[PDB]
């Protein structure tokens with residue numbers, strides 16, 4: 001055994017030992033319990049970043065832990081390959097997105113292999129290959145014929161300078177984020193998944209997920225946004241009907257979740273597109289201007305609640321069906337056409353948004369709920385104003401004194417008897433628009449024929465292959481400019497026809513890839529029945545919190561769609577969910593000519609602990625704040641530089657020790673060095689142990705007869721095994737597991753292990769320590785284990801707790817006063833807490 005730890009000389013050998021043993025290449029072996037551990041697969045963007053290394057090290061720790069516990073562990077990796085990154089790189093570099101993508105995959109794959117992740121590379125998928133995306137085209141066609149996928153006109157943000165469609169997030173003050181041109185609202189036909197048909201199942205099935213973080217489930221519930229409310233119809237006042245047709249001339253229908261407060265409504269509000277808004281605005285320029293502003297907004301959903309709420313009065317009035325009040329109709333920017341009826345009532349005394357709106361416009365606030373003897377102040381919102389549980393109705397006529405549920409039913413009764421309303425369930429959830437006007441994505445398998453309509457491509461003709469010999473130029477979506485792609489014959493009649501040229505939302509590929517891993521070469525279906533039956537669901541899913549709403553909702557939805565098609569047997573794709581925190585780093589810059597900043601990458605900087613300077617010249621830089629690693633402030637630390645300087649195990653150890661997985665992980669030069677020094681210490685501890693006599697049989701069995709010092713070390717050892725097992729298995733807090741092994745090594749360092757029994761215990765300590773750390777730093781532990789013991793580390797298995805090492809050897813002593821037993825220097829103090837002391841047997845209190 002070499003004296004000094006050298007990662008470069010042991011990490012490739014360990015990797016070849018694992019590869020040759022095919023330990024990570026798993027099959028559907030019915031004789032070993034399965035465990036499916038999945039880290040969210042990466043976009044092949046070019047090179048790994050620290051977020052990747054953190055994520056996949058966490059996944060590898062859990063996978064290797066389960067492997068040592070005897071599970072048949074599938075840990076697959078693949079590439080989420082479609083999307084805008086490659087399209088832009090193409091525009092920037094004059095290369096095909098496919099060529100850029102495949103070169104990135106090859107490079108990043110080598111990087112992942114160099115980190116020693118126990119990955120089943122025979123299950124690799126790349127979502128941009130027709131062998132993958134043919135199956136989501138297949139599902140699309142099946143659902144399209146059932147109406148679960150449908151085609152409908154929708155409104156998009158069109159950027160006329162860049163000639164591209166923009167998400168709301170890419171619109172800044174009504175202008176495209178890159179072009180700076182005013183965007184145009186355009187109506188275009190698009191394809192939608194009818195995910196609202198599954199809203200109730202997606203909501204209720206969250207309750208099954210006892211091993212999901214409660215905040216992820218709360219976010220999904222709020223996103224789905226089910227409410228149980230009341231449709232209420234306010235008759236349009238006789239003076240307010242000009243310009244109105246049909247039922248819009250008769251009543252204004254609203255939806256409310258608080259019909260118990262209907263007696264306290266003081267105005268109503270409609271969307272900009274509502275017919276009452278249109279009729280009121282016909283002669284009123286301020287209203288026309290307000291409506292135009294509302295229609296031109298592009299506020300992202302994440303920002304909707306934060307936008308300033310504004311409205312304009314219409315001079316039109318409706319009548320409250322309960323109390324007969326005439327209420328003015330307002331147009332408001334927070335009422336969205338297409339949600340419910342596009343009209344709401346307002347109760348400013350008991351809804352905080354209505355309170356602030358009414359406070360702004362000096363609209364009335366009417367208390368109709370009381371909570372105890374709490375004083376109501378119309379001028380200041382109090383939390384109890386919105387309480388639904390502990391209030392009773394006041395100022396509500398014959399409804400006074402009722403609680404929420406009784407008042408709800410009473411109002412429903414009154415409204416239904418009048419014909420003025422009825423209970424109604426609503427969902428915030430929108431259907432999922434999947435059309436993208438982009439080239440680098442899965443083609444939509446539709447052919448447009450003027451005789452037959454929008455025709456799904458037959459299953460025998462799938463895939464619709466995306467041509468890879470394309471370099472986007474930026475002047476519009478390439479597929480629409482390629483008649484060699486879109487000109488075709490109709491599969492139903494043989495006539496002239498055109499292929500759909502929009503591609504699929506790339507969330508589609510990540511909504512089912514976890515099933516494709518189960519049989520990635522299966523050519524007769526999305527996933528083979530035998531594989532789906534064996535692997536079932538993902539046991540452990542690991543990924544970033546930014547995917548907690550959309551990706552997870554879509555994956556759950558696709559799972560239920562595939563279940564209903566008879567392809568899988570589970571209702572939910574992911575049993576346990578671990579969401580990792582971001583990686584952050586200090587920022588540095590040097591000053592600018594126009595009073596700005598230009599940002600320096602950390603690896604090009606050297607500190608002095610006073611100031612910092614640039615490595616190339618040694619001139620001063622300015623240390624700035626710490627924030628998430630990104631190209632924006634050039635504070636990404638390249639993991640390849642970390643691996644080149646210290647090796648894979650140091651990178652993995654630092655990532656796992658620096659913070660618990662959910663916490664933000666702060667890049668630290670000294671922390672990286674400390675991780676490396678600990679691996680050197682581990683190496684030296686084993687080297688020095690073996691140099692004093694070589695390996696012996698590890699201590700096992702009855703420890704009666706061991707010295708106290710060695711009993712104490714065995715107690716620490718099995719205490720540490722218990723802690724580490726609970727940290728890996730239950731708490732998923734790997735930093736504390738590492739610290740526990742460090743404390744064990746500290747106690748070992750202070751214990752004399754030179755005797756025959758001491759060497760047996762030292763062997764037991766070191767054999768446990770290297771297996772406890774193997775999930776985290778497998779290369780060095782594999783190597784050290786081989787010097788300690790001739791068995792296959794993965795066949796020795798996870799260390800077992802010896803409960804006998806955890807019980808302490810007590811001796812029962814009799815106590816007596818004046819020679820008569822009255823119960824049963826250290827022993828003197830206990831018998832007084834109960835003086836001749838016959839050592840260990842008798843203590844006598846000279847009364």
Ligand SMILES: CCCCCCCCc1cn(CCC[C@@H]2CO[C@H](COS(=O)(=O)NC(=O)[C@@H](N)CC(C)C)[C@@H](O)[C@H]2O)nn1
Pocket residue numbers: 039040041042043044047048049050051052055080510542543544545546547551581582583584628629630631636
């Ligand atoms: C090189 C110059 C730039 C430096 C950048 C530094 C970034 C540091 C950072 C980032 N973050 C956020 C979490 C990142 C997780 C990383 O690993 C997985 C794959 O990320 S991906 O490739 O972006 N693919 C995806 O997120 C999707 N393909 C997953 C699909 C299942 C939907 C996911 O779990 C992610 O959530 N924290 N620190």
Ligand SMILES: [Mg+2]
Pocket residue numbers: 208210
């Ligand atoms: Mg359960």
Ligand SMILES: [Zn+2]
Pocket residue numbers: 449450451452453490491492493494495497
């Ligand atoms: Zn046809």
